[PDB]
Amino acid sequence: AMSLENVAFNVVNKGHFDGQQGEVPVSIINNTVYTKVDGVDVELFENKTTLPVNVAFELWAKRNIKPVPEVKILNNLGVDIAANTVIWDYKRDAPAHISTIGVCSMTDIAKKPTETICAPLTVFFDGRVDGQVDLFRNARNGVLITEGSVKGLQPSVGPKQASLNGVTLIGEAVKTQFNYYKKVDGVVQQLPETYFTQSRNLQEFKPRSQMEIDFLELAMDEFIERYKLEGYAFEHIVYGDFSHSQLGGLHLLIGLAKRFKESPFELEDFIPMDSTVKNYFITDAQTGSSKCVCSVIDLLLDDFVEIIKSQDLSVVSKVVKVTIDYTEISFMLWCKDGHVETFYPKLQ
Amino acid sequence: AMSLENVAFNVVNKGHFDGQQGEVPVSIINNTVYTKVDGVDVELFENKTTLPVNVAFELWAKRNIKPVPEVKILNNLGVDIAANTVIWDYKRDAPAHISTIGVCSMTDIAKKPTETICAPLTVFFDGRVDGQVDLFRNARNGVLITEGSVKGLQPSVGPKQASLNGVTLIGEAVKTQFNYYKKVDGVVQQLPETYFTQSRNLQEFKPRSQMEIDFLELAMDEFIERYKLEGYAFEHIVYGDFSHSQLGGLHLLIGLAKRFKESPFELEDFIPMDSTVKNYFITDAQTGSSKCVCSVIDLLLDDFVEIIKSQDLSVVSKVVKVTIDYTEISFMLWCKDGHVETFYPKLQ
Amino acid sequence: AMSLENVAFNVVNKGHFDGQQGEVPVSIINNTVYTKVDGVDVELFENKTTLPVNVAFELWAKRNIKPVPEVKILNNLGVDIAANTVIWDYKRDAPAHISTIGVCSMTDIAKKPTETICAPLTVFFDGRVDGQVDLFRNARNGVLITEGSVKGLQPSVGPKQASLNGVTLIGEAVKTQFNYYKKVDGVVQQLPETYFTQSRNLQEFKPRSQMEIDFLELAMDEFIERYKLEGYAFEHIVYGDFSHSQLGGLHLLIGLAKRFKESPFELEDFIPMDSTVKNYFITDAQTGSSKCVCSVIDLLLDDFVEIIKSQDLSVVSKVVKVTIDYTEISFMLWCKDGHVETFYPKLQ
Amino acid sequence: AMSLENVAFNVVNKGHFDGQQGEVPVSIINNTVYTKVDGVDVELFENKTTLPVNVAFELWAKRNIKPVPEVKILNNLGVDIAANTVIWDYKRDAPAHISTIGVCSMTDIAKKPTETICAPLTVFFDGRVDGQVDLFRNARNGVLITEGSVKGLQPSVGPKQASLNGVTLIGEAVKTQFNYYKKVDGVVQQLPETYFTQSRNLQEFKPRSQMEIDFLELAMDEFIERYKLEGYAFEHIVYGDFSHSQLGGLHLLIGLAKRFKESPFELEDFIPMDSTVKNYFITDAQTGSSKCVCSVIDLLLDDFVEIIKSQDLSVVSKVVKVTIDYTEISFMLWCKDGHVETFYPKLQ
Amino acid sequence: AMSLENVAFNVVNKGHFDGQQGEVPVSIINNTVYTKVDGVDVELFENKTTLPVNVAFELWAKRNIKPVPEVKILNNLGVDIAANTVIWDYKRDAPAHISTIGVCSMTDIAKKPTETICAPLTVFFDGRVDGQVDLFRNARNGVLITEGSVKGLQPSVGPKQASLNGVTLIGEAVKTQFNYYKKVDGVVQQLPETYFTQSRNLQEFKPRSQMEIDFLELAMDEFIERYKLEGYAFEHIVYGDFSHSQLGGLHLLIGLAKRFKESPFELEDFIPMDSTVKNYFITDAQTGSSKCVCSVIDLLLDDFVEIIKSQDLSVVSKVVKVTIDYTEISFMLWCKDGHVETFYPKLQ
Ligand SMILES: O=C(NO)c1ccc2ccccc2n1
Numbered sequence A, B, C, D, E: 001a002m003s004l005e006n007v008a009f010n011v012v013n014k015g016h017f018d019g020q021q022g023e024v025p026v027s028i029i030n031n032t033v034y035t036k037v038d039g040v041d042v043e044l045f046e047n048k049t050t051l052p053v054n055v056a057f058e059l060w061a062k063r064n065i066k067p068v069p070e071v072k073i074l075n076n077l078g079v080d081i082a083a084n085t086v087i088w089d090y091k092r093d094a095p096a097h098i099s100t101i102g103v104c105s106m107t108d109i110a111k112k113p114t115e116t117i118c119a120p121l122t123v124f125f126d127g128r129v130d131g132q133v134d135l136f137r138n139a140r141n142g143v144l145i146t147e148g149s150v151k152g153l154q155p156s157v158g159p160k161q162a163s164l165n166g167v168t169l170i171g172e173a174v175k176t177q178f179n180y181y182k183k184v185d186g187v188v189q190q191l192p193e194t195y196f197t198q199s200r201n202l203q204e205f206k207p208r209s210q211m212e213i214d215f216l217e218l219a220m221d222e223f224i225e226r227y228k229l230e231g232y233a234f235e236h237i238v239y240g241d242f243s244h245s246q247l248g249g250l251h252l253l254i255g256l257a258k259r260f261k262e263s264p265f266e267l268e269d270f271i272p273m274d275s276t277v278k279n280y281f282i283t284d285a286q287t288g289s290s291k292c293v294c295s296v297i298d299l300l301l302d303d304f305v306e307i308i309k310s311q312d313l314s315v316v317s318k319v320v321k322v323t324i325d326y327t328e329i330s331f332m333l334w335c336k337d338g339h340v341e342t343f344y345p346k347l348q
């Protein structure tokens, strides 16, 4: 018994769609959904999507409010659609997927993921919901997350963090670390060994190891000395070079966080979406050093040190592929006389 | 159990809101309501009102589909709101009234016209709906229409024509001539003696008397001779003068209809709404004679002849008040040497 | 080298997309595409679709400008998408299909219909384009049109008429009668025996048989006598009954055309789309007789006479299924004492 | 001599509508009002209301720039409209009331509050404006604020704080504490004894008593010991329980402010408007503990302690009504063995 | 080979327009430009301008990414248009100039500034781009910036700061201090001796002299004593008077910055654009002291002290003109008994 007024009733009374009966009066003006309170219109939702306002309002109300994988993980695993839920992409203020299964009559391609339309699509399944592990076993293509063991299925331990209502966190009162499973063409796929990005913010950056604590506290030369990083170009790659008009290196989020404590900078997110590697048009406010496309990855400093120290430094230019968030990230490694000149997530 | 999807279901299946149960998927984009049919969007409604699209869609679906008084009559009688119906104004593509009573949760000021909010408003009552004659008897302010006699109340015979789904017609299979009643502050009013406008179109004009048949079939001079209209300026007022840059007279719709058979002209409706007197910016295509504000009234030619022949012709300029469609219409009468120079429904 | 400016260049210079090189300056404001001519903006396209304005502009420019099957035929045959063309639905001012194959980067699900994404979809193939008869031979699901015989495939003779740039016509300078072929899961189907709707207009209705000429020229009683139609309720079904508030019958377009010559009426197309059976909210202007949902079919009068004369008239109410335009149309047949009371294309 | 260009002139030159003569060129595009400065358009106003852009621009320019009661107080007192002023609701970026009296020709229902249309509405009157105390005495329904004594009228001392240009403050250079008066149906109403919410922010929370200073400084167990709060469930109600997936208690703003100093959290304001009790969909970032509907009230901790300590703790579940901001707030009190389990502002 | 898809390709791959070949699929919906990434739409640009969305997207992509003069300087120098670049006004989120020269086919009035259409306009030229010094010499009207000496041209040393991608900074890795040159009617104009505004923020205010360090650190009376400012009304003008309902003085940004450290205030920017003197509707949160039009200038405190100490204090009211950012700023100086009462940038 789906309706705009019923979705609005649930939003007003339950904070989201909760299957409750009831209707509140709604008015739609342009891309905004309002409801009357004390005789005046109160905004319930502003449509920032390319879907019609009432359709986007319903998908947002029907968003998954449990800790879910971050959209970058779902994308890296090739997820096309979710089974009977909406994964809301808070970085885009829009549904992470184009279509739905058993969610909304306007976006639904099927009511159940067992319908033949879903067979070619990689359907996301949530083992925490009854019957979804079985649906993944019956699905030709899919990604499954579970909180525990699935008999006979070899697991892949995912990242410690998950997104709960747009807040990325490592759960203490809830479980955020899932087992991951993927199927392509009816065959369970072995997920590769992977590093995970840490999903931290520049403003609220917290070190997650003794090496990261030492990077933020120690001066550049004493950190590079303590961790035997001479010849690995951390001065350029991690700390950043702000002496020329073109900003040098600065590809690790921890390096940007260290710089940010001393002086501010503009980070233009010209493709605003969740991704393992981010590209920013950066402008350093103190110096005026800038770079149109500065690729940044948030790896734990220990993980980045392990990656760079595991490379052969005998060639001028070389592509280094590293698995991060289940995707293969190409890095461009530049060496001279057995030392690193630069190492960065390869542009385009 | 009112909803956007239910209103749309009724529109798709019943041609209008008919209280049926059911829901069809809807999408709202800008000011248009669509529904999915065979996987593609089909337009159900385009909002031309100043109300939110979903609210206007519901009032339009809940429009009165019986022959109703023309909006110009309701306006002339001071009608503010209708009891448990929507009078749709097809000339404005919008609800004739701002608010509703027992129609839509967004526009309702009350569910029943007996609520104290309605007491100061002139509520429209339709005696053809059960209990509405009694609701008018108990209302402080209101206008009542009936098909027959009401005990104790003296009737006012309204116009022969009514609007059925935006088509103004004199009913043959349905009754369109109503008895009108009005109450101001609990007192049944004596509605004044009135002429009625004929509500005809220029393209499909039909004569409704032997005088009108003779006006259309005879030449100007033999019609004026046959009906003894010499000195009443019908050459200017009714036939129109297209010899100068400013178009002379042409204030009776029958005169425009006669001209239209010979040659076309642009009639710019700069205030598009139903009214007893209409104002057009007219441009005659044959001559280039034009007038920014040409007031036009559609009176039966016999009624116009009666009005003009009942005037004192001894003053240069004078305001002549005529009750038409229950409202007071001011006409400007210009005379010289005991003869009419011009006579026109007053502008501003 | 697809671009908005290049599509606009083709529209301005070729009247549609013609693969020409060149760019014209464009401005997009709301849902309208403009181009600068002599320093001022000239409207090229107004988006009436639910797609983004620039995407809809490109699909419209890339529309098929050859005579194509009417959208109602494509829909009845279960067509989902077209191979390397856009079938423009002129009744909806929108693409007939959601997605494209080798047409536009925004709507394309594939570049060639041989891609596995297309295998479950019923792809439309035009045998007049090189290689499309062979692509249909190798397709799992599809509909093929040809002007002549195809080796091995038994044809279904389609309707005489086709749509050329939104004008439905029986071709004299072009071929509009196609052979139809259909495959479901790799198996060539036997298309059923079918009647075809005539796709005529009310304003420009032309009789296509001696029976239709006699229906329009003769009086009701002498036509029913000449064709031995007594007891078949043509007075109600075809001619229409305008004596009561609810308009009786009037379900054949020829009957509406005959009425239209005498007096006008409002036909409200509340679901504006191409379909075998149309539903109108009709209001007769002469009488005020009206009907919320008046189902109308344009069948050749001889075909309708054949259908009604081939029914058992011994039951009160019964569903009569008739294959029309390759689809199953349910009619409601009402009889009393061995005579027809009513017969109408079923509503909802 | 009201005009869009005159309103814009006043905004540009006076910072708001100040009755000055003059006109500046304006352009309206979509929902934004611009003015030309140095040959380019500069945004003057973005319409976030459901009123037409030019109408909302005028009401915003004509907003009251003196300290006025917070919208939650006006709503709790049943205020429908203001006399000859606009109370701007800065939390909704819109007028607090639908209609106006003597403010704008598009929204005005009357020019003076003495017009009979205003009699049923509760009109807000401002004793600081000449003749408004007299207008309240003559009004059938109304709310009056004054800075002092009104002869014969029993006052209600309002909150210490008022809103000045959207900034809630306790005035030092201006008076913000008003006397309140209310009339219903021509009869002056006795306003009840009430507590007042403190109207504080989470980010800039300041303690307003020694108890509040001790709550923020002392550890949970030593505060509960110092103030003899054992058995009153402050650990759940005020401090909050973040150990389970569902966040426990956390209904006093001071508790959220204390938590916020240690770790951040998302507070989703799903009904964004000023109200005595607010509902938030909260997500704790440290733990992942969340609650769809977490009712929060900003009471002075001493006032909340007084309310909870004045309750009978001998029943399992009970509704406790407390007057706050002149409205009756229902609280749900849950007890077991003579001790509080929970106490919260009752949902829906 | 300009196109929307090519501009979008450059934005996605280069962070701005960089003349690269390539096309990405784009969708335009309302005022937003999107591109498809991982099957979903990602916002590339939101149009906040009065230009069409696709046109504004192109001008923003073609914005100057080198340090450029702040828009207030260009405006004060009478700049109408820029030669072959777009100066993006980040305070208005729009192009600083209406038209372009050799930038975009929709906004271009010419391809080269040597075209006769540009002769009456003051064209901005950038000496850092090849051939632009020559173009300024050949231009009838223009403003030129250079990093060094132009033979025969007398320079004007501009401000130390410039805007790089919307960040105002004094360059360390880039040059931000330019030589300025202006031509009116083919004649090189002598730019006047001028002070420069410091372009600082309230939130991140940094003192740029020992006097500014002492103003922020010392108490009001000891600063006025140390710098011999008795009788110059700094208590009113710079520190601000918050004791009355109307906020007194507070016209120097440093005074607002000092106040901001102690308590917050609302600064309503009612004409949001870059200008030498800014007007704010200020509301002090601590006291409730407010002012509709509070003119604020960010001068180095030493420069303001020099200006006020260089005035004759023997007249009641007097206009003091001071050249700041190349424009003449009128100040209103009020004196009594040889002492300053007030001194402020003259309103309107
Ligand atoms: O003829 C009528 N058309 O509406 C009419 C007249 C008088 C009535 C009195 C009571 C109830 C209904 C009535 N209806």
Ligand SMILES: O=C(NO)c1ccc2ccccc2n1
Pocket (backbone or CB within 6 Å): C126, C127, C128, C129, C131, C133, C134, C145, C146, C147, C148, C149, C150, C151
């Ligand atoms: O007559 C035709 N109209 O499309 C037709 C028939 C058979 C064909 C077989 C192969 C290629 C093209 C063909 N074309």
